[model samples]
Target chain A: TRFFIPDTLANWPWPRALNPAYEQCKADSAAWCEKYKAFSPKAQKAFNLCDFNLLASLAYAHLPEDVNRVGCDLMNLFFVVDEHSDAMDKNSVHVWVEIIMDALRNPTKPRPDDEPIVGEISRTFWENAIKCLGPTSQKRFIETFETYLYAVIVQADDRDHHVFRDVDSYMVVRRDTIGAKPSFALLEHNMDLPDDVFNHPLLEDLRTWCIDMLILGNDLCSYNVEQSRGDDGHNIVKLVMLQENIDLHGAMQYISDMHDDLADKFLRNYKNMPSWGQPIDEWVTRYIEGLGNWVRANDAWSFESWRYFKYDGLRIQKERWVELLPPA
Target chain B: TRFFIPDTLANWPWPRALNPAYEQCKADSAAWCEKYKAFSPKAQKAFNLCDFNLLASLAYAHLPEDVNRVGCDLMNLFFVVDEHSVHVWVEIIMDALRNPTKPRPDDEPIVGEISRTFWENAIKCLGPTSQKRFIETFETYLYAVIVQADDRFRDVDSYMVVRRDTIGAKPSFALLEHNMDLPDDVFNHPLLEDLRTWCIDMLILGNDLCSYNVEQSRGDDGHNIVKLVMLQENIDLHGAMQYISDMHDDLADKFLRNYKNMPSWGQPIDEWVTRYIEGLGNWVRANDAWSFESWRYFKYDGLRIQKERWVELLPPA
Candidate 1:
């Protein structure tokens, strides 16, 4: 009665490969997180135990070696801002968004002495990211990140007001609040996809399907964990239930079915895709496959990590029930 | 297999009040449809019996008598143009639409004539800003329907991009202030724009869900969301029906919430904007009501289907 977690990727057609650089990226970013201390001793212990370096390894498995390190650090920075802002009041979250956005805008400048550690964390990660990512990718990353940071304010305001956006607006809101778009801009960091070919309506829709699946899959796996701390208001599980008049099991299945529909459409659209010729087509193929594969990677890592499911994530994932936790 | 049409409007809270001038409007529109004769005697009889005048009466019930007749005629003009305009009529209609004050070629169909007649008469009472926007928005409808007319299957987002305009909600919305004068700034405000978008979507998806069966029966369902979702999700018709049913309700909920989120754009313009939004609400409810009530889709079973909300799937024409 509590939950029935569907295998969201059971029929997912995309293939996945772990980056060869995982262990080193893991070790290096871990050392950096500990040195910078994005967590208290216990929280940092939990962070290390979550194995996000492995998450990045799967998501950015094909990122070239040097850029791969920045990829893992980008993952770490995403989690850092998420957790830091997740603990804030509405007014404080505004300041949190300001600091992170301003730091990225001026990645090389020294932070004000009074700013939080996230300023240095963001600035350092972005500064190194630019050393590898192409100029367009770097610029696009900031633009997408700017939208996500502003969405953070909207998320906090919704939480404080006890208001939930209807599923339409919420999905659009979640697309950024979950910070998937900026990460996707990194997927094609090396390919110089021109505006005409890259912003073609077809590819844009495919990217949206990829982002939507990420949002649904992540929210499904983490809703119990998020709700345990009263942070579930922003998750899709609560959203479907609130709007559809459905139960936890029904909502879980609703999202699972919704995810599968998107997968089918993405694949259908891919098979019938129009082309832009030669190397551009090849680049599009990989970039699009990467978009679909990212969903698979995120889904796979969600259950393997202790971030949401703790010790039994793998157990509960296949065994299927995520027993409900009453609010704290 | 029988179709399951969800009571897409069961929870519909918008009130439906009829215009007191329905008979005069109806009696007179019969004369107009006959006078112009867009259809053969049989099709024209069916069109008049459909009581579109009553439909518009419900939609624009709050308008005063003189403006209310124009609203009813506007409904007649839309269907007249929708049924008569073909791909070749694109430039023909554009000629009359852009030069609304001019006479049309007599050899051309009555669509351009009635369309020009509607536009020319409408500007007399319509606000200066609304008269201009009606032209621009209706031109979008003309252009979008042409794209829809080309007969290609579209992906979900791509399907909506065109269907949004082909639904003709924008021009119909312009008439919400046909009797009053709301300026261009208040008309183009972002909040009102979003509200208008939701209303259009709410109208489009609802029409699609109701109209899909008849559309598919003739192998003419190329542009329908039902066909799109069926192939996209690889689902049966029942599942596709349920998919759009939920999808329609999603927009309904979204429309109401966004309507509530309307802000103060200020002044008598504030009063005008609220009236505009309320008219939008009326159009949504009236569109749904008439979709079920009109014999255009349901024939004699219109009222019965609105009650039972079950459409018996029709086989090929």
Candidate 2:
């Protein structure tokens, strides 16, 4: 959302620096590190892999890297959609998913003959991710057997369904103007062809999955920003329900029902799919979780704090994005 | 300037056949005959003093207005700036200025009542004309007057120079983007207070002169835009001839040779003043000639052609 985070390639760039946003991400990472320090390396790696899937998708969407700082918040969004976890940290299968996403969003721009080491590893990891999807996830995946390549790509458009959702442009507008909320009507007039977007099978399935995840994820993410009655702390999805006039207790009741349905479907699908690589799944899940913690702890806090200078304070606030967090 | 345009504020802004921009302009005496013929008299009177001052200022600033079209190009920008003028027209002044600019960049919000009008005038007339002297413009005019008002009154931090120049934040990259027309160092950071600005004096001057002659005097008045050129023509203060860099010119050589012996200091000051207002004097002379011609025709063709757009055009090709 415009009020929360930027969602554009131009605003969120690659090969950036130790800017305010990155600093917040580092702090968030450190906090998560301490919070989950007791977990085994295997368990931590599993969560990291899941977090990486989100980062890969976000990065592929070409959103600015700052959104990566919202990794925990985003995973909370996923939990809203599907609460089922194969392992304690849910990291085992996430890393490979992220590798696929990274390859898709930001493929190597360098010449093929001069490939970097990271590029080669990322390529191998990406190929391995396709082999790692569980029977349940593969039910939604389309493959061409040996020729198949895994990828993730995201596009940001101004015609977002919600207001003040384009955080990146908001930052720019805030940078340029004082006191007033910035506004630009980029999606006022537009005409497009469906074929120009994505193939029917690929587009529909991906969109359905992302949208389902977003609906729950966004609600979960918006929890603290809203007033709620749920004792189930920090559940953004529950918070939004309270905002919409529903009690958190009642909302949790709905979530319980949905979770049951999801679990049943997952079980049926998991039992029916073809064989895949176990190692790839474990690798992907860990990477995703690690990436998320890295992004949130180190990036967002610095950025939001830096922007605080544009407000009505008497002097430079001196607070960094990282400082916005609890003690690491 | 605002009080004088009476018929301009005729109606309480009724509807018209034209677009939203020209809705309230005075129709019975509306400038555009074509629009008047199509719209109601009530709708035309809705055209108020704000439209007149802005359009008149534009004409004085050397920007053209459509004779058969209602609403001015500059007013379109004012609409976005303040939403005061809702009328639509052919070309919007802001986009026109930016389209050809080397450093294609975003526009800053218009600052205050009068200052906003001046900026509209500046971009329309001054923007495209000054190429090599463009940098001087930001320092002397834009950063000083326009930005200062915006920051002081409107509390705007981003000045027009900052938005268009993209200074400091992305200066070096912008240099490469603009085909190297802009200098990278131009973006070097400076506190906002360090920049200076001027009042909308130039725009007000143009409006006062143009409106007085065209509206009050019924077309028998001073022609200021032409007067400046006339003043230059009369005294012949050629940039190439009188410029200190013209060492090869005979006048420069003569001035150099006579400097030590010349003792008439008072005479030199008087001569300088006379030369400075040379354009004004030539303007009076030219108007005298035009008035004499008008006496024969018994009509106001010169003022009409200059102020309104009834004259037809021929294709060069």
Candidate 3:
């Protein structure tokens, strides 16, 4: 019972070129990870926990130089917090979320001496983001990030109780937990769209559609790694099985079909979309192309990252790749 | 440009079986046509005004004999009213729609007599539950007709809103409960609303496709979904057809998805739900087949004989 792979990513039209400012992001990540101990020495030694190149390759491929640097910083921060949160209890996760939220909300405020690595990283990203992004985008980022924190807590609860959610509930929580909304918010920052245009309903749905496509790709690629951690309940493969009363292979096929259905809807809606006129429409097209880049790059990075599929280094050598997942 | 056919109907899974009483319906329909001049002689000479087999085949395959017969009667009545109302007929149609219970006097004209006879036979044949449901649905059907009439010059979306109700799909579905003798509570269950809506949409959308040639040839393309979509999306006919077809397929998928996950109403009611859903699928299949086979659709080669172009936007004058 093999699952069909959605062809949406098979021949992606967008370029997966890295941002020009990637070297600066690399240097900043190295210094920050070294100085703040964002990951413990033991955690950093793991093949997968902190790959700055993977972060840059996936998220900011088409962003402007300064905005790309800020995006990389945020991506690095997310990975650090993600790795740390795996060991945290629900209560500890809530505390971490609040501390990070406070840092993001008031980056200019005096930092507490007792602030942890997560909070410090948030403050660092926010300070850079605020400089690059205007007040309107800053507000969108904060709000979307708040949703991400709340979803993180939801995921923490699921882990705490080993809760198995039905398909509908799983999608609602997973959408936020994947942190795609906040990441998409970065598109507005990089492109410098006015608040009104950025928040248009058509753009909003398109963004969510893109996020869903990327998240599904992430889920498929990260399945083995996540399943190893006993986190299959949040996995789409598991959710489909639970909801549809299907076996693993059936669930996989269902997810693939669902992805294809969504892609078809996306293409149809895109064709029907009305233009907003001249330069704004031009910007919208580029912004949409940027999202396309994000999706393609994220899939590429998943294959390349040692965190998800353990391989020797940065490049994914197909000849030596281990593609089959472990028995569940 | 040539329009794309939706892949949904290409390999549609449902069977289009007719009721065992279809032959009887055919004979009865023929007799009724001869006895009553429902359509003016001039209109009848222009086009074949009736198809008894198609009407019976498209509706009520598994229904009880008498219920199926009444269903056929209503189907004939609808076609009669539809064809006759193409001209100066308002008060005559409204009178029958408004007074389902009252009988016309002996002195009344042939059309009024036929309307009164149809309603009286319906009342006599149906149980109280079926009668009340049918009357209520019949009232809605009349109201939707008026809404459609008003929407003649309106925009596409406005016409679509009224078209959904007036397409006669809901009343046809309302008849299913009576046909199968479902309990009132089971028939009206809230969960059934989703199934009903999906089925209605599938049928109407399919109807739009199958009837497009006839509707367009008759100069009635304003309210046709294909035309509406063409106008709304500013796309050519081919693109609009593709869009509608895809939409129909999506709804078909949703119908099956919901059918699979539908919560149980326990015992026979759930079984009934399954049968009813199957029946709806059959309705789509039957509707499609009849539309292709019926002479009403081809107009006896009117498109060729009249030198009417098929792909033209509106009906030929």
Candidate 4:
């Protein structure tokens, strides 16, 4: 069944192999990671996660505005988290959003059924991936998926955090979602990737970071895509995993650690940091820098305030870079 | 020349011996001080100056959201200064603000004219009996003003920041300056002393800080008050002080240091800590707490993910 994705890929997705919107989403993620690497590591991760969900959700739902809203909301959320990280949990900080899919899933609820397509796709992906991976790998994959899912959801943002504890509030109402509609111009612009732009040396390292960020951005925007289908709001994490983590606390640490590594790699490769220091020991430091910058660029204003071009330009850089690096 | 201010307690101005707005402005100043203080010591001072300029400009105009807009733009400008203290000079920052106030005392620009109220009141209270005394002691004073100001211009938030570099874009034209008469409901709000609830504690301190000022000093509002007639469209810093470090390179470090400590109860304070810290440090530190509590109480997307409040609020075993 895992081979289903391969088959699907071969069949060719409707959005096309080189989707402009997808590419723009990818660029935004990379730009965000590079510009925000100076924020607290938690914020960096949260930003990345938020953007992934945003972009993925947008791609899944085919909503441009949802894509744009993710960035702004993520920006606001990062500030909230940066100012408050000292008191927050490293995991489960993201707000979960559930979309009402149908009468069967929510019979007693007041709302009419709103079947979702993305949720089914996520479930299918998870089901297939589990079948493809050997049992041991499956367990590892599921564990990672669940961990990242929590990271994503815990980092999820909506204007209304309390009311939307469940995903449904976000998908159905749109009130709880993080971002506003993306610039259609941006969506249109993202369609055609100039190969020369993506392969720029300055952006080579940043492109990978961008890809990951977009992955999370997609997750943020597409949050409702799954909820509307009656699947778990954060099903993407499960889709990424084959086995759930038995030790939530330990896995939380593991997930954070993994994110921190990604942060350092992004910072070093993109920011031209001379040294990331030794692993594990340096992770905390790098993460701190990442978190600080993330908050600074996105929320807290400063002299080196963010410029629009940085993100827009980065979109081009990663389109070519992603062509170079394939997911392991 | 000085009679406009009055001579002694005998003739002691009917507006009281002080400018009520000055006194009230003190609350604004004190509130400003408190919020600025929440940053690291260096950031506290640096942001204090930046905030003071922004707030002073707002208070001069009797508008608060202008301050919030300025606050947003300079977010963490405090931390940057605090962190980059060595590379930065406190005097340069002070000069950036003060030089704008100096252009030939007789020819002070209108915005400078607005600030003159603050200077005159400070100078007056410095007489024998009031030496070393000033208006607006607490940090909340400014925040209350902030809350008040935010209430005023929440409608044109987009324009608030835009006007910082270009005053013509300000909503003050329609609402504050004259009968450019746009939205009456949005513009209507009282400027009362005791009515501030946003940062009540800071308001009290703001009020307390202005006890000695002759305007707010008279117990009305602080000397900071100015009628809309005082509003001018253009105001800017002077040429000499244009660069960030004019204070260190050209001016006296002692003067810069003195001005920073001038507000404190006669104590040595760090300036680098103040300059680099971002948006009102007071809010940063307080919001550190605010974020947690807001996150806990309001759980929609709760992107704030405030964990501290959760831990603090959880039932203590």
| TM-score to native of every candidate shown | 0.50, 0.19, 0.50, 0.19
- What is the lDDT for A96 in model 4? 17
Query: Clashing residue pairs in candidate 1, if any?
Result: none
Off by over 4 Å in 3: A1-8, A47-52, A86-95, A190-196, A275-279, A312-328, B1-4, B7-317
- Candidate 4 lDDT, B1-317, residue by residue in tens: 01111111111001111122433544455454354334457655545443333333332232244333332222233334334431123333333334434543454222223333334333322332121111121112222222234343222223323223121111111112211121222122221111111222222222222221223224342222121111221222122112212212222222211221212212112221122111121221232222222212233322233321111111212
Which stretches of model 2 miss by more than 4 angstroms?
A: A1-19, A37-40, A46-84, A87-328, B1-19, B25-317
Cα lDDT of all candidates, in order? Answer: 0.77, 0.28, 0.66, 0.29
* lDDT of candidate 1 over B19-96, digit per residue (tens): 788779778766766687577677677677677888888887778765667777777777776667456676777677
Single out the weakest 10-residue window by summed lDDT for candidate 4 chain B. B7-16
* DockQ sort, best first: 3, 1, 4, 2
Judge the docking of candidate 4 as incorrect, acceptable, medium or high.
Answer: incorrect
Worst 10-residue lDDT window, candidate 2 chain A: A180-189
What is the alpha-carbon lDDT of model 4 when measured against the actual structure? 0.29
Error of 3 at A44 (Å): 0.7
Whole-model lDDT, model 3: 0.66
Model 2, span B115-143: residue lDDT tens: 23334343443322232233233233333
lDDT of 3 at B21: 81
DockQ of each: 0.01, 0.00, 0.01, 0.01
Instruction: Between candidates 1 and 3, name the one with more favorable TM-score.
Output: 1
